[PDB]
Design a protein around this ligand. Sequence first.
Ligand code: CLA
Ligand code: CLA
Ligand code: OEX
Ligand SMILES: [Cl-]
Ligand SMILES: [Fe+2]
Lengths: 135, 156, 102, 28, 248, 92, 58, 51, 333, 54, 34, 104
Amino acid sequence: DLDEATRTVVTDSSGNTTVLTPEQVKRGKRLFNATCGACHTGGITKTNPNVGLDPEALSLATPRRDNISALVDYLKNPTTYDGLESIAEIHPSIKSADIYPRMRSLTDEDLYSIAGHIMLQPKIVAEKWGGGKIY
Amino acid sequence: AAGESPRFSVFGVIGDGTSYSEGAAYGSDQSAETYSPYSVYGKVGSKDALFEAGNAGEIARKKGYIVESQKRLKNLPGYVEKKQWFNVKDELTRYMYETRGAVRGLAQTPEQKKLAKAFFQAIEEASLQATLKNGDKCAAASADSIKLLDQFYASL
Amino acid sequence: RMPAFFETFPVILVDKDGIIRADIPFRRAESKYSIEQVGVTVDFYGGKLNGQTFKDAPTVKKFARKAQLGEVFEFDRTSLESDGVFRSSPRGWYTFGHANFA
Amino acid sequence: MEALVYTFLLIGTLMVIFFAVFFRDTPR
Amino acid sequence: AITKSELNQLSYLQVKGTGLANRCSEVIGEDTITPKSGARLVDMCIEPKAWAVEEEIGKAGKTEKKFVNSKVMTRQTYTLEGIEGSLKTDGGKIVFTEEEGIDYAPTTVQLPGGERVPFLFTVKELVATGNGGAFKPGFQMGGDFSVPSYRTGLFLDPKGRGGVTGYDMAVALPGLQSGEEGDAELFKENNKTFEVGNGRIEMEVNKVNAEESEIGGVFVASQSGDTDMGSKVPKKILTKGIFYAKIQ
Amino acid sequence: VVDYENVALLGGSQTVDLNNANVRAYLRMPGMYPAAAGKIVTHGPYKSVADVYNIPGLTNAEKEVIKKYESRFTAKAVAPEYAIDRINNGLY
Amino acid sequence: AYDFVSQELRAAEDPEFETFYTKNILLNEGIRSWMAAQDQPHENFVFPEEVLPRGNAL
Amino acid sequence: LNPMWRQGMFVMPFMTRLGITDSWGGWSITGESVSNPGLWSFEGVALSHIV
Amino acid sequence: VSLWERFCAWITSTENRLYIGWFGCLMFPTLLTATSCFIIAFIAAPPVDIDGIREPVAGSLLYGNNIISGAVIPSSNAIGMHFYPIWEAASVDEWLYNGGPYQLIVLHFLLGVASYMGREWELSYRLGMRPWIFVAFSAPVAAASAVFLVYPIGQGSFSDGMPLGISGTFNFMLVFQAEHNILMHPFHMAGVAGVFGGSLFSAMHGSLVTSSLIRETTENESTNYGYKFGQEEETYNIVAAHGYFGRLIFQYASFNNSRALHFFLALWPVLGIWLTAMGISTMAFNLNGFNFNQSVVDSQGRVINTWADIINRADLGMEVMHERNAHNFPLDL
Amino acid sequence: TEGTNEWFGVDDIRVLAVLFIGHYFILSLWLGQYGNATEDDDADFFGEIDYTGS
Amino acid sequence: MLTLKILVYTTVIFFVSLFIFGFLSSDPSRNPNR
Amino acid sequence: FLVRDQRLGANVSSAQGPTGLGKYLMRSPSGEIIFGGETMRFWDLRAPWVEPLRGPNGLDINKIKNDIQPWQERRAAEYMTHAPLGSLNSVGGVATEINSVNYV
Ligand code: CLA
Ligand code: CLA
Ligand code: OEX
Ligand SMILES: [Cl-]
Ligand SMILES: [Fe+2]
């Protein structure tokens, strides 16, 4: 079963955690598969395999994106891997929602659920989130 | 363990309803409104949508597009003088691909609509005369397009 | 060791519990368990090479390749002009023939 | 040198087919 | 067509399939340029028109090293384009110092008899020194260049052995892995190597157009061929053709 | 070649060879991948680790980010079969 | 009936000989290496990524 | 140093005695390069006698 | 009588040893040129660069191949779907280096088999028969055309057609299974059922008809000698065969009408082959078979495997190893 | 050449000439038999197959 | 290579014309019920 | 991938592929400059998002080096991940992909 111990994920940089409701899991999976799945299926990046979505890659990024708040901030303002340049014109985001029409109907809860799905997947599948075709 | 009846959910109306795998839900398993029963997203203009419509960023982007498009349009007479038609056809579609979007987004009053229509017709004529290899008509159309875009930006 | 059911098998070195410690990589670009990196050495006891030890990577790799087929022997490959592919013993030909006949 | 054997076998089969088609027992 | 100004007047749909894209342009005039400082040769094009391979032939009761003609087995994919470099003057002479561009193209030629000889036609890392200080009819320059390997380290031979990837032994013959010496007789084919070659080119200018800053002429070149990852002895190739460049 | 001595410096260890390693080897040093590594892997051979500071066009930021990780670098002999593939080596 | 010995010998000594038979042999090697780990779970096969045979790119 | 009479050829001498000197492979019996051997080469004659 | 009338009378004559007809005017030259080119190329052709990467592959007997491994290599990948006749090459050597003979053979051969179908109909018409044998023959023609022409058209290159050799077909099948997941397409299942059922029905019909022979030879004469060319005897003494089939299985299932029996015999394999040819033609446009990878999960969310996942592992192993030097980017589009 | 868009692959006068010669030669042979056909309203028939001689 | 093209075109047009004009010569009446 | 590698700092005109033929750019059998790889068979393509970079003899090196617009990048990224591949039950992708997308 999906207990509460396995639904506990880190929210901010200090280290505080939270418990995701069972409905948030379903909403996050649905929204992720609908919006991200074309390019980020299985936790990999198709158009740039050097930057994945596995926890290790998220941890060695500059603004550090291994928690809910950093993921939401990235979705509101993307940057490069070193956090120096903005890439809002070549990546979907709220800032550039006038270019990508699929981001014009997203609320804060939607971003929270998507980030929760991304954070939750490694604890469930393990070494298959961002692993590739070998697994 | 020893004995437990499995969970049941009949079409989402007789059973749990939210079991991570239901199908044929059409909503009714979340505390939110959707665009339609066949949709996953909500309404675009809703009160809690993070994206506005017509904020400062959009206007700045469109105006930058228009200014750089004017700068790009100022190159065609040289191409026509050198009889390089492929350059004429490529310049009107390389950077200026977003000019139609910017112009249609920034036009509200009827006179702006008329100016936009005239500018679009002028550039279409310029491209046609470039692909037909006629220098005089192409040069005249390029001058007309430059003048029309300058007028439209002035009217902003 | 190479199972009798395969024809080509990778070279892998494991410890007393089954955890890999070295191998011969197929892609030498981001390998982590190469013999050069780990630094494996080989010693010989008994037989013709009694008491000798080797420490350089190439000889260790050669002996590791040889050791996945079982014990290592010295052969005379010129008297009959041997090719290099294994063959079957009289225990197999008899079975094949008489089973097909039945 | 085995190419000769292969060619001979194939041409022999073709000859057999030719003789079967054109020198055949009358069905009557 | 023949000049750049005529070529720029055609459309892509009008050139596709004709074979004009593999040709080199022509220059009209006899003037002088004289490069200032910070000049760069841009848009260089080199087109070979004859190929020959060094061999041993019999003329009359004797054998000599003669260059025999060969036929191109591939198709019109052998012209170098877009080469750029930086010009300078040392003691009144011009030096080219090639930098970038499409400066390599594989080619295969067939010798009388049936043998196929592949090679990598290139001018990579070229330094050419002239005999004068201005671009005029009669100007000449030439120098050495470096020839890389035909196949890189990621190539796999039909048995799955490569340079930086693949097997390191002949897995189809497990009976060669016994004794103090294993497959030592296959070491040459199991150990792939990648070494650089060398070449030489000589160019001469014939036409100069000052109002367009263009030059053109002929060239003669020679280099070494493919080595099959260090398993065969390379041959020697000789080529001749024309060239075009712009000093803008 | 069958035997390559410096195989551990290609990205499988804590030391990276400046003359033969691919750009992916720098992805495990934070704040260095898309800006400084691209400049490092597209310039000529270095006779020493100190030679990387003479690259024409290095902004300051790249200089101190390289100074932070200088202790993880080394410069060995150039192998042409490895140095030619430093931007894309076919691994994805 | 797996191999043709003469073709294997020539391919071993000449790294330019190629037929469809060698291609099929390589395909068989790929099948074995990528299938054995999960097809026989009782053997506890462990193959690191650096050991699995593979071509360029994909 | 390796002429045709040292390789055991028996019918080739009678072919080259009357004029045949070129082959479809691009070589000639005297030592040359052939661009277009034509119909009557060392192979056309064989195919003709066969037909 | 004009000369043209006499020529027409000879062409459509039924007195010839082999019927010519007007479809023969197309059938004979094309098939003969295809046969000649195929024999010459299979014996003595030089290696061909099939993948466009300057890596030629040998396929002729004179270059070190046996009957099993020899083939005629498809054209080069650089050519694509472009027409490549002999006169469009700079020399014959270049034509042979780029896999020229493949296009010639396949094109003249497809025209030949279409004319063969037409000729079958034409002789049926001239003899006073019913005109539906060539409809039955249309299924193998459909399959051969499907592979040889339709697959290259969909994939965009002649180099993806089936090689004219024995192990070339094995290579074709393995790569096709790796890339399109056949064996899960229902049309392939229909084709397999068609061939298996055809063999079963053929064996049943042969056994039933042969068992019900009437005694006219005694011992020292092959039973085949009892039949005379022109003898009148329906092809089964009913009581025997009918009772045998009614007792062997459920009695209500027994074909007592010969017309229906033979119609079913004709119908089954032809429909199966039609369906499998259409399956190949549709998969030529990337409409693959069923995909059930990672479809069963537990309550927590972990994946429980099935046999489809093992098939997927085999497919991955085949995929990562084919055309090793040809790809530069992650996706095999 | 190869990718150009000539009608029927015709790039020279001789090709057109030989095509014309072929169609016309067989046409003349056919005319030698069917060149006396008339359109008068008594050569027609009322049926499915033209059995009216020639 | 042009002469080969000319010969092949001649052969193809000859046989195709034979086919075309053969089917126009009152073919439906060539049946055993004439 | 040409755009990505060029942005990383590569000189995408002189790069050599594994076969020695050219990783990104090469020549068609008639001379025109085309994209490299297995896509050499599809060199006849003409699309509105790729024509602005074509000259009278194929792709233009000067335009490619320093005149590529972000909208072309967006179009290419969108089209690469929506290729016409899929299965009967509408999974989408190559035949060895997992069940995440629903697209044919
Ligand atoms: C159009 C016909 C034709 C042509 C042009 C050729 C051409 C050729 N043949 Mg071929 N051949 C042919 C038909 C033909 N053949 C036929 C039909 C046969 C079957 C019998 C053969 C059997 C054949 C063989 C077996 C051989 C050739 C060979 C050759 C080549 C050398 C010829 C040679 O040296 O002869 C020389 C001929 C002679 C010396 C004959 C002399 C004639 C005698 C002296 C007549 C004397 C009696 C006379 C009636 C006296 C009364 C007349 C007087 C009153 C004026 C040459 C390319 C040779 C070759 O190299 O093949 C690869 C070869 O070995 N041919
Ligand atoms: C037991 C397992 C099994 C079985 C029974 C089958 C059965 C079949 N598979 Mg199959 N397959 C299997 C496993 C199996 N497969 C596996 C495991 C794989 C994955 C590796 C495949 C991959 C696969 C592919 C990729 C294809 C098949 C195809 C087929 C069909 C063959 C079509 C055919 O022969 O008729 C067709 C008949 C012909 C092609 C003959 C045409 C004859 C021409 C017209 C005339 C020839 C005349 C000749 C040249 C001259 C005669 C000589 C003269 C002297 C008389 C058949 C239904 C094929 C198919 O569906 O066909 C469309 C196909 O393309 N399978
Ligand atoms: O050629 Mn036959 O197989 Ca249709 O995918 Mn891409 O190309 Mn090649 O690889 Mn995979
Ligand atoms: Cl690719
Ligand atoms: Fe019967």
